[PDB]
Swiss-Prot record:
It comes from Escherichia coli (strain K12). It is found in: Periplasm. GO terms for cellular component: outer membrane-bounded periplasmic space; periplasmic space. The cus efflux system is composed of CusA, CusB, CusC and CusF. Interacts with copper-exporting P-type ATPase CopA; when this protein is precharged with copper it binds very little CopA. Part of a cation efflux system that mediates resistance to copper and silver. Binds one copper per polypeptide. GO terms for molecular function: copper chaperone activity; copper ion binding; metallochaperone activity; transition metal ion binding. GO terms for biological process: copper ion export; copper ion transmembrane transport; detoxification of copper ion; intracellular copper ion homeostasis; response to copper ion; response to silver ion; response to toxic substance; response to zinc ion. Its main location: periplasm. Coiled coil: none annotated. The cus system plays an important role in copper tolerance under anaerobic growth and, under extreme copper stress, in aerobic growth. The keyword Cell membrane does not apply. The keyword Metal-binding applies. This is Cation efflux system protein CusF. Keywords: Copper, Metal-binding, Periplasm, Signal.
């Protein structure tokens, strides 16, 4: 079995409810539905805003859909928006 890696983070899609937003510390705290791709159960997790994250208007209590990558020991948001 080949073990070499192109080291390129998969984009992980998830849903949850926003519990806290800290634009300055670059963290959005989200109580998410389970995420099968990474074998995470329902949890509250801190996700990181990068300068490239495609933000939209979100607030505490919103149901959101979001995408993130696992890279540099952090969960880096690719985008986030309100969701059904």
């Amino acid at each position: 079995m080949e073990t070499m890696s192109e080291a390129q983070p998969q984009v992980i899609s998830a849903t949850g409810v926003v519990k806290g937003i800290d634009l300055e510390s670059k963290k959005i705290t989200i109580h998410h539905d389970p995420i099968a791709a990474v074998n995470w159960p329902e949890m509250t997790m801190r996700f990181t805003i990068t300068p490239q994250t495609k933000m939209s208007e979100i607030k505490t209590g919103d149901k959101v859909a979001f995408n993130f990558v696992q890279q540099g020991n952090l969960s880096l948001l690719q985008d986030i928006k309100v969701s059904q």
